[PDB]
């Protein structure tokens, strides 16, 4: 039964010769034998807030999702199909759930390595269906309908909120199924799950400068509703396109042994 | 206009800040919220679900044999089947559980666990065990006489096939820090009797052990999990 | 104490299992009006597809790793559900799975009868995605290559987060999972997508004194509250 | 938007300023205040002791 839980629950003190009964575990019910029931307790008014375990507080961290250095004289720009599959520290944290519903909050952080130039950059967000650029000076950068954001380098980082643009009501993180309707379609790729493309270029023309532009993209998923939790992935990933597994050669996180072994069970 | 001065920390990008930002798609109507079953609104719902301990996390236990503890008929009375150290921190029988994997995204943890064992013998297979919860600080008991004195439960198979053993929350501090710690507790299990099977049941039964967290569990100070981290194939196909 | 479950014309005699598993606490229902997309009138076989399609009983020996049936790939080529799947464009259906593993009192073992939503499988030791013939097996289902990691790198030790029951051959010989419609979209494509995955995994393997032991596991899936849209042919 | 102009003393770090700053740990629940004996709420309590 749904109820508002702000803090962790209290403990009631317990009460020679109590007589309990049997347990139901084979039915798939986690045992609700309270510590009040089983063992000797005291009254603990538990004020421990549960707020940092909330799914909104569990996933809204601006994690690095894209980092490329492009030289400047994909040459002279970079595009990035917005996925959560990129860095496996965030990927395992979002593969805990089956269906996610989040608004991304992209924060493009631009740094320049080698009298530093104050360049101007354009982070055009191309959704799926709109055409993506192929040069630094293509006519797609000057598109009216795409949501370009023009930011310099010596400023705060450019931050835009990308909404929930799945055509379904949640992102299928795991898609047990095939894309399209032709049988050569790729497994585990939902066509609805595609965010778009975040194409960043340098708006300036060709400058004789020897400076490399490192661009970091920080996605903070927010307004998160998450459904159907899953086992946390224990084996190492093999590709961003699928859930293949190989494991380490030995424990921990191996195929034959996820937990690091000990000598015996009576150790 | 409005006279404003810039504080320190102006123009910083704190990665854990909570500010409204500029919507890239104005008057965008998102896809309406359809009621999908099983919404997690708090990750303590995931932790309170029972999940199998890898009690037999030794060598020569390949895969599936790590989740069960073989009760033989060649074993003797008052012998130690298993001890389960309650280090969610250390790489023990609790690391690959639901309570163990979600708490390793955190630093501080506080609450009552809940072990549930399930005997997976035959219907005719009788005998007894004794599940001895050793509190923190106390070392792992070796003889059964040492451990029929703790917080034990003498568990007969042929009557009761599943036993809840509440691990209470015993700590002076409000929280327990995850390290980069010994004697957080022990659940040991001893042969009160011998395993008693007939001449047609198998003489090597097994125990599946579960662990959950009770409704008083809590977690704070989020960190990155040590369970994952790093080549990854087709990683540049998202750019190209 | 024994019981008969009669949906439609198909009936199954069952043991009274206390606390049948309503998956994620929900009972399957038809598509509500405020969550519907396809405007045409959905065909709703109220007893023609809402009946127990008893699949082939799989032999559980000692060395069995597990079994998985992706729903509704198990049922696309069977009966009035299989006629409506291949003559409509969409569907929306819950399921009532009744896995029954009938053994004597001298058999031991434990099954995790788990119903995995969106079981994106993995292939071991290759970076190639699993093909169409590795995922869409059909009525025959698939044997787990590595059931300890659920064939997708996750953990079986945490697979109880899913809707699941246990068949411990001491206590019960049957498990019953009542699956709701589990998808982001209100209807989907049965020839392409497979929402649930009934996975039967023997955690504790089978056992008796004779080494050649076998216990059949009967799977019976009743697609409850079927809708369909896009009637052709 | 709001027309603002920068005063002098904008961007300075005065080490005795009193401003709210950005919390590094959002929705952090600190350890609850347990009544520890002998709270000093003013350092003239320390001075009045012989």
């Amino acid at each position: 039964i749904e109820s508002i839980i702000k803090t962790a629950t209290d403990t009631v003190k317990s009460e020679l010769g109590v007589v309990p009964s049997l347990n139901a575990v084979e039915t798939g019910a986690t045992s609700n034998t309270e510590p009040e029931e089983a063992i000797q307790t005291r009254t603990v008014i538990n004020q421990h807030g549960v707020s940092e375990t909330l799914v909104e507080n569990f996933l809204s961290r601006a994690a690095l999702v894209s980092k490329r250095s492009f030289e400047y004289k994909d040459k002279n720009f970079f595009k990035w199909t917005i996925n959560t599959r990129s860095f496996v520290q965030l990927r395992r944290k979002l593969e805990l759930f089956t269906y996610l519903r989040f608004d991304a909050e992209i924060t493009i952080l631009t740094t320049v390595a080698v009298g530093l130039p104050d360049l101007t950059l354009q982070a055009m967000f191309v959704p799926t269906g709109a055409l993506t650029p192929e040069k630094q000076d293509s006519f797609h950068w000057q598109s009216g309908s795409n949501a370009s954001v023009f930011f310099k380098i010596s400023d705060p980082p450019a931050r835009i909120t990308i909404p929930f643009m799945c055509i379904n009501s949640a992102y299928s993180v795991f898609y047990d199924g095939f894309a399209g309707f032709e049988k050569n379609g790729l497994y585990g790729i939902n066509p609805a799950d595609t965010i778009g493309n975040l194409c960043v270029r340098i708006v300036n023309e060709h400058q004789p400068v020897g400076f490399t532009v490192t661009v970091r993209v920080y996605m903070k998923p927010k307004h998160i509703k998450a459904w159907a939790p899953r086992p946390p992935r224990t084996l190492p990933y093999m590709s961003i396109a699928n859930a293949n597994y190989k494991g380490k050669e030995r424990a921990p996180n191996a195929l034959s042994a996820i937990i690091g072994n000990r000598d015996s069970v009576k150790t | 206009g409005v006279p404003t001065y810039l504080l320190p920390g102006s123009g910083q990008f704190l990665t854990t800040d909570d500010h409204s930002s500029a919507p890239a798609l104005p008057c965008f109507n998102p896809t309406p919220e359809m009621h999908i079953p099983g919404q997690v609104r708090n990750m303590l719902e995931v932790v309170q679900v029972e999940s199998m301990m890898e009690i037999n996390n030794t060598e020569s236990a390949v895969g599936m044999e790590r989740l069960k503890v073989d009760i033989s008929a060649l074993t003797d009375v008052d012998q130690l089947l298993f001890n389960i150290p309650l280090d969610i921190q250390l790489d023990g029988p609790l690391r690959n559980t639901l309570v163990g994997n979600i708490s390793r995204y955190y630093t501080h943890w506080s609450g009552s666990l809940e072990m549930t064992f399930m005997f997976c013998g035959s219907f005719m297979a009788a005998g007894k065990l004794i599940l001895c919860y050793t509190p923190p600080g106390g070392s792992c008991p070796t003889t059964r006489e040492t451990a029929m004195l703790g917080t034990h439960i003498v568990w007969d198979f042929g009557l009761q096939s599943s036993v809840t053993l509440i691990i209470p929350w015993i700590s002076g501090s409000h929280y327990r820090m995850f390290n980069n710690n010994a004697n957080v507790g022990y659940v040991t299990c001893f042969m009160q009797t011998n395993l008693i099977v007939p001449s047609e049941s198998s003489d090597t039964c097994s125990l599946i052990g579960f662990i959950a967290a009770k409704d008083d569990f809590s977690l704070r100070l989020m960190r990155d999990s040590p369970d994952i981290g790093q080549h990854l194939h087709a990683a540049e196909a998202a750019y190209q | 104490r024994v019981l008969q479950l009669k949906l439609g014309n198909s009936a199954i005699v069952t043991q009274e299992a206390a606390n049948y598993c309503c998956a994620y606490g929900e009972w399957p229902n038809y598509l509500p009006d405020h969550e519907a997309v396809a405007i045409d009138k959905p065909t709703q076989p109220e007893t023609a597809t809402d009946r127990f399609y008893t699949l082939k009983s799989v032999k559980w020996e000692t060395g069995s790793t597990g079994w998985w049936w992706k729903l509704p790939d198990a049922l696309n080529n069977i009966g009035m559900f299989g006629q409506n799947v291949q003559h409509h464009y969409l569907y929306r259906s819950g399921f009532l799975i009744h896995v029954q593993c009938n053994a004597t009192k001298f058999h031991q073992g434990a099954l995790l009868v788990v119903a995995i939503p969106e079981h994106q499988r993995g292939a071991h030791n290759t970076n190639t995605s699993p093909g169409f013939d590795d995922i869409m097996k059909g009525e025959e289902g698939g044997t787990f290559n590595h059931p300890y990691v659920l064939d997708d790198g996750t953990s079986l030790a945490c697979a109880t987060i899913f809707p699941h029951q246990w068949i411990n051959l001491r206590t019960n010989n049957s498990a019953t999972i009542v699956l709701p419609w589990m998808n982001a979209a209100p209807m989907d494509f049965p020839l392409r997508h497979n929402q649930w995955t009934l996975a039967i995994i023997p955690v504790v393997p089978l056992g008796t004194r004779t080494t050649s032991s076998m216990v059949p596991i009967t799977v019976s899936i009743a697609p409850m509250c079927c809708e369909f849209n896009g009637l052709r042919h | 938007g709001v027309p603002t102009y920068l005063l002098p003393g904008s961007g300075q770090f005065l080490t005795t300023d009193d401003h709210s700053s950005a919390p590094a740990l959002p929705c952090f629940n600190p350890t609850p205040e347990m009544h520890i004996p002998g709270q000093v709420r003013n350092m003239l309590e320390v001075v009045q002791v012989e």
Partner: peptide, 28 residues
């Protein structure tokens, strides 16, 4: 939120509702 779009707001970290008895007790 001084923007006109409700998805543009800061993260609403206020949903303290739970229902653990759809996972720990998914039974009838």
């Amino acid at each position: 939120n001084f923007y006109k779009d409700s998805y543009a707001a800061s993260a609403s970290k206020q949903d303290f509702s739970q229902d653990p008895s759809k996972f720990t007790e998914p039974v009838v």
